[PDB]
Amino acid sequence: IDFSKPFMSLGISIMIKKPQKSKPGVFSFLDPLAYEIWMCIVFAYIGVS
Amino acid sequence: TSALSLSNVAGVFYILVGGLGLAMLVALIEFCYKSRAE
Numbered sequence: 001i002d003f004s005k006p007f008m009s010l011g012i013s014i015m016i017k018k019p020q021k022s023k024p025g026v027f028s029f030l031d032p033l034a035y036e037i038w039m040c041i042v043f044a045y046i047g048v049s
Numbered sequence: 050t051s052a053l054s055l056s057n058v059a060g061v062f063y064i065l066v067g068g069l070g071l072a073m074l075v076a077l078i079e080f081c082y083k084s085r086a087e
């Protein structure tokens with residue numbers, strides 16, 4: 001058959017799952033340390049006092 | 050990068066509790082000495 005001129009140029013692309021904006025949590029300033037450290041600091045604080 | 054675990058700062062906790070035990074020992078030794086004196 002004899003095609004006509006392309007009316008839509010395309011190709012092979014890459015599709016991935018759209019990511020999320022990862023809205024920071026309210027209490028995210030605690031993230032640098034683990035929950036165990038934060039809990040142990042309170043225990044250490046009480047003990048020292 | 051993960052949040053620091055207790056295993057990263059475990060040694061300073063041991064030093065702190067050791068210091069708290071040493072201070073109690075030191076304090077009670079003075080108390081024990083003074084009590085004997087008088």
Ligand SMILES: CCCCCCCCCCCCCCCC(=O)O
Pocket residue numbers: 030034035038039041042045
């Ligand atoms: C003066 C020593 C301690 C007082 C101030 C330190 C603040 C501690 C607050 C941490 C709350 C307990 C952990 C929250 C749980 C989590 O991080 O997911």
Ligand SMILES: CCCCCCCCCCCCCCCC(=O)O
Pocket residue numbers: 063064065066067068071
């Ligand atoms: C300045 C006052 C004294 C402070 C330090 C007191 C000693 C506390 C205990 C130190 C850690 C003991 C455990 C060692 C761990 C290991 O190497 O396996």
Ligand SMILES: CCCCCCCCCCCCCCCC(=O)O
Pocket residue numbers: 063064066067070071074
């Ligand atoms: C000086 C009076 C007594 C004080 C006792 C405080 C002891 C603090 C240290 C205990 C360490 C025990 C756990 C060791 C962990 C490890 O070796 O990895």
Ligand SMILES: CCCCCCCCCCCCCCCC(=O)O
Pocket residue numbers: 077080081082084085
């Ligand atoms: C981890 C072990 C703890 C042990 C705690 C026991 C403390 C004994 C000291 C209390 C006061 C004793 C006063 C004795 C006075 C004296 O006869 O000189």
Ligand SMILES: *C(=O)CCCCCCCCCCCCCCC
Pocket residue numbers: 069070071073074077078081
């Ligand atoms: C006078 O010298 C009498 C008292 C002597 C012994 C005192 C013992 C208590 C002080 C040490 C505390 C240790 C705390 C940690 C326990 C694991």
